[PDB]
Each structure stands twice: as structure tokens, then as C-alpha cells.
């Protein structure tokens, strides 16, 4: 059959020892696509290709992650988490779970990954760029998702020369970090009998993370908050963990700010209250336009500042306000001391001294222990 493109193959009860692709961590500069855990895979291990859109003009939005965790080829097969939320706010998600995963980079470059079962003839597939200039997903799950997503990357800096690192254990890529998002599916009742139209609004941003660890979430984090976002000329993406309790470890972040495509803020480095570039990151408790996750984090947002580093460095401050729900799923039993993730559509405000520019955003915050 084939020549040269290079496969990775992942499928439930099969063994991935006789697998030719050799594993890999972080590749400075590159957008790190390809699996990481190729022929083993630490028990604990785990990878995700991560693709969002938010509408400015309606508030629509999608979030999807495409995973591919060791458990996975033991039991279950691997995951792919759909959510939405339309302009008026009712939401559709699902987790589907694929016997296949398999990710190919083919002759001229682009990589290729699919989630399908030869069982139901079903499929999720995502495709990227060689340069990375463009990514799309196609939905084929009859009965339940069919349509697709295209993202296409901004002018200006790609930040994909930057340090990934988050923290000791994971690693942070944002191939693509700011696009302009298109989606169009056919979203399933539970019954499968009906199809609803969604469309994701006009002007949305979004961009593509990717994300792994050799280690579980919980042996890696207590605690996440994701923000993307566009707000006028600048652009920003933010993960900030905080340790898992009886750590002694710092927060960690990878936290990047943008204006008009240039890269102003490469933030390794989360603190409270200037040598590198850093994050403040601070939760509010404070519009009749509020919503809280429905766990015991009953924050109504944060705020947001980069500092460049140096005397003299600018910074950026921006207000994010939680507007909207886009998931609440619990990371416990169900009681006052719950928790869980909350996706949010954010809505923002800010910038330099004497800005404030508008904008929205995808919002995710996580609790666990």
C-alpha cells in the first residue's frame, strides 16, 4: 500500500508494540500534531487536539477535543467531545467514543487524524496544514453529528516558536493560536429521529490547541482555567494550573497575548500582584449578564493582565465577565463541595491604559480532588 506517510494506528484491543513510529516530546517550533505515545503508552498517558469558535456577532460557539488516552486501547476506545451553544443559548453536546484512532502524515505534509468505527460506519476527522495556515474537521456520526468546521489562520506571528511547557509534567501547543472559525452541522436528538441546523455566526475567532501528558489530570492539576479570545487588535489564548494539592510546585500557565498579529506577551510564568514576561490571573465574585459554573467555584470571572517583562514593558488588562453556560459536567459526587467544568462563553473588555475594546471568548475552568 502506501509510500511515505508515516501512521500512527490506535485500536481497541489491538496491541500498539509492532507500531514502526518511534514516540516523541515536545519538537521546538513545530505544531507537535503527530502522537506522542506511539508503540507504548504509559498507563496514565494521554493527548488531545483541541479546535474552538465564538461568534462576535452572536455568540454561537463550538468546542471540540479529540483525545487519544492508554485506557482508551484497553476499554472504550478513544474520545470526541462536541459541544455548542446557539446565539439563544440552548446547548448540544456529546461524547463519542471511536474503536479507531489513526493519524497520518501524508507525502506533502499534512496531517491527517480520524476517530471512526467500521461497526456503525462513523467518523470524526480533523486535517492540518502543513503550514499550518489552515485546519478543517468533518462529522460523519449518522444519527447524531454531520457537517464540518474550517479554521484558517490570521496574519502575524504563530507563536509556535515559543516554550510549550506546563509545568513539570504537560506540554501546551497552540498550532494554530488565532484563526477565523466557519462551522456547519446537523446536531441529532438523542433519539436520533431529528436534525438541528447550526451554524456558527459571523465573525468568529478560534484556533487549535494541542495538549499532552504522561501522566492523569489529577497527578498533573488540581486546577485549569482556558481562555481564547479576540478583543479589538489583540488576541490572547491562556491555560493556568494550579498544582495538585500537597504539590509544592508553582501555578503553571502558557499564556500568550497578541496585537494586530504581533506576539507582545509570552507568558511562562504566573504571579500574584518585571524579568519575564507574566500572568496575573485573578477570580471576581461581583451586570445582571452574570452566570457561575454549578459546582462550589461560584466565581462570576476573572481578570486578565500580562506584564511584558523589563522596566518600562507595556501591560494589558482585560475584565472577563462569565455571560453565558456552555457545559457544567461534574468531576465529583454531587454535593455542596462538587466539583467540575464549566465551559463559558466570556465576554471581554480591555487593553492598554485608556482602551477598553470589546470582544468574546471561550472560556473553561476545571476543579478536581
Same mark, same amino acid.
Given at each position: 500500500?502506501?509510500?511515505?506517510?508515516?501512521?500512527?494506528?490506535?485500536?481497541?484491543?489491538? &496491541? *500498539?508494540? @509492532?507500531?514502526? $513510529?518511534?514516540?516523541?516530546?515536545?519538537?521546538?517550533?513545530?505544531? !507537535?500534531?503527530?502522537?506522542? +505515545?506511539?508503540?507504548?503508552?504509559?498507563?496514565?498517558?494521554?493527548?488531545?487536539?483541541?479546535?474552538?469558535?465564538?461568534?462576535?456577532?452572536?455568540?454561537?460557539?463550538?468546542?471540540?477535543?479529540?483525545?487519544?488516552?492508554?485506557?482508551?486501547?484497553?476499554?472504550?476506545?478513544?474520545?470526541?467531545?462536541?459541544?455548542?451553544?446557539?446565539?439563544?443559548?440552548?446547548?448540544?453536546?456529546?461524547?463519542?467514543?471511536?474503536?479507531?484512532?489513526?493519524? &497520518? *502524515?501524508? @507525502?506533502?505534509? $499534512?496531517?491527517?487524524?480520524?476517530?471512526?468505527?467500521?461497526?456503525? !460506519?462513523?467518523?470524526?476527522? +480533523?486535517?492540518?496544514?502543513?503550514?499550518?495556515?489552515?485546519?478543517?474537521?468533518?462529522?460523519?456520526?449518522?444519527?447524531?453529528?454531520?457537517?464540518?468546521?474550517?479554521?484558517?489562520?490570521?496574519?502575524?506571528?504563530?507563536?509556535?516558536?515559543?516554550?510549550?511547557?506546563?509545568?513539570?509534567?504537560?506540554?501546551?501547543?497552540?498550532?494554530?493560536?488565532?484563526?477565523?472559525?466557519?462551522?456547519?452541522?446537523?446536531?441529532?436528538?438523542?433519539?436520533?429521529?431529528?436534525? @438541528?441546523?447550526?451554524?456558527?455566526?459571523?465573525?468568529?475567532?478560534?484556533?487549535?490547541?494541542?495538549?499532552?501528558?504522561?501522566?492523569?489530570?489529577?497527578?498533573?492539576?488540581?486546577?485549569?482555567?482556558?481562555?481564547?479570545?479576540?478583543?479589538?487588535?489583540?488576541?490572547?489564548?491562556?491555560?493556568?494550573?494550579?498544582?495538585?494539592?500537597?504539590?509544592?510546585?508553582?501555578?503553571?500557565?502558557?499564556?500568550?497575548?497578541?496585537?494586530?498579529?504581533?506576539?507582545?506577551?509570552?507568558?511562562?510564568?504566573?504571579?500574584?500582584?518585571?524579568?519575564?514576561?507574566?500572568?496575573?490571573?485573578?477570580?471576581?465574585?461581583?451586570?445582571?449578564?452574570?452566570?457561575?459554573?454549578?459546582?462550589?467555584?461560584?466565581?462570576?470571572?476573572?481578570?486578565?493582565?500580562?506584564?511584558?517583562?523589563?522596566?518600562?514593558?507595556?501591560?494589558?488588562?482585560?475584565?472577563?465577565?462569565?455571560?453565558?453556560?456552555?457545559?457544567?459536567?461534574?468531576?465529583?459526587?454531587?454535593?455542596?463541595?462538587?466539583?467540575?467544568?464549566?465551559?463559558?462563553?466570556?465576554?471581554?473588555?480591555?487593553?492598554?491604559?485608556?482602551?477598553?475594546?470589546?470582544?468574546?471568548?471561550?472560556?473553561?475552568?476545571?476543579?478536581?480532588?
Amino acid at each position: 500500500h502506501m509510500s511515505n506517510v508515516t501512521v500512527s494506528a490506535f485500536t481497541v484491543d489491538k &496491541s *500498539i508494540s @509492532e507500531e514502526h $513510529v518511534l514516540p516523541s516530546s515536545f519538537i521546538p517550533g513545530s505544531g !507537535n500534531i503527530f502522537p506522542k +505515545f506511539t508503540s507504548a503508552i504509559p498507563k496514565t498517558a494521554w493527548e488531545l487536539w483541541y479546535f474552538d469558535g465564538i461568534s462576535k456577532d452572536d455568540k454561537s460557539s463550538i468546542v471540540i477535543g479529540v483525545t487519544r488516552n492508554a485506557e482508551g486501547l484497553k476499554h472504550g476506545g478513544f474520545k470526541v467531545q462536541v459541544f455548542v451553544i446557539w446565539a439563544d443559548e440552548r446547548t448540544w453536546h456529546r461524547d463519542l467514543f471511536f474503536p479507531e484512532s489513526v493519524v &497520518s *502524515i501524508n @507525502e506533502s505534509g $499534512v496531517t491527517d487524524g480520524i476517530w471512526k468505527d467500521a461497526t456503525s !460506519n462513523s467518523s470524526i476527522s +480533523f486535517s492540518c496544514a502543513g503550514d499550518l495556515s489552515k485546519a478543517s474537521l468533518v462529522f460523519d456520526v449518522p444519527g447524531v453529528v454531520q457537517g464540518d468546521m474550517h479554521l484558517e489562520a490570521l496574519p502575524g506571528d504563530t507563536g509556535l516558536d515559543t516554550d510549550a511547557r506546563l509545568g513539570p509534567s504537560v506540554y501546551y501547543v497552540r498550532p494554530i493560536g488565532r484563526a477565523s472559525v466557519k462551522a456547519q452541522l446537523s446536531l441529532y436528538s438523542s433519539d436520533a429521529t431529528a436534525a @438541528e441546523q447550526f451554524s456558527l455566526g459571523t465573525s468568529a475567532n478560534g484556533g487549535m490547541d494541542r495538549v499532552w501528558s504522561p501522566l492523569s489530570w489529577p497527578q498533573v492539576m488540581t486546577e485549569s482555567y482556558y481562555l481564547r479570545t479576540q478583543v479589538g487588535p489583540y488576541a490572547m489564548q491562556i491555560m493556568r494550573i494550579f498544582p495538585p494539592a500537597g504539590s509544592e510546585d508553582q501555578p503553571s500557565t502558557m499564556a500568550r497575548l497578541y496585537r494586530e498579529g504581533q506576539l507582545v506577551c509570552v507568558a511562562q510564568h504566573v504571579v500574584t500582584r518585571m524579568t519575564h514576561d507574566s500572568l496575573i490571573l485573578s477570580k471576581q465574585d461581583n451586570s445582571e449578564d452574570v452566570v457561575t459554573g454549578g459546582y462550589r467555584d461560584k466565581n462570576t470571572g476573572y481578570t486578565v493582565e500580562f506584564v511584558e517583562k523589563g522596566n518600562e514593558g507595556q501591560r494589558w488588562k482585560f475584565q472577563v465577565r462569565h455571560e453565558r453556560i456552555i457545559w457544567n459536567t461534574p468531576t465529583s459526587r454531587p454535593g455542596p463541595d462538587a466539583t467540575g467544568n464549566t465551559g463559558f462563553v466570556e465576554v471581554l473588555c480591555g487593553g492598554t491604559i485608556g482602551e477598553s475594546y470589546e470582544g468574546v471568548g471561550t472560556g473553561g475552568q476545571c476543579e478536581l480532588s
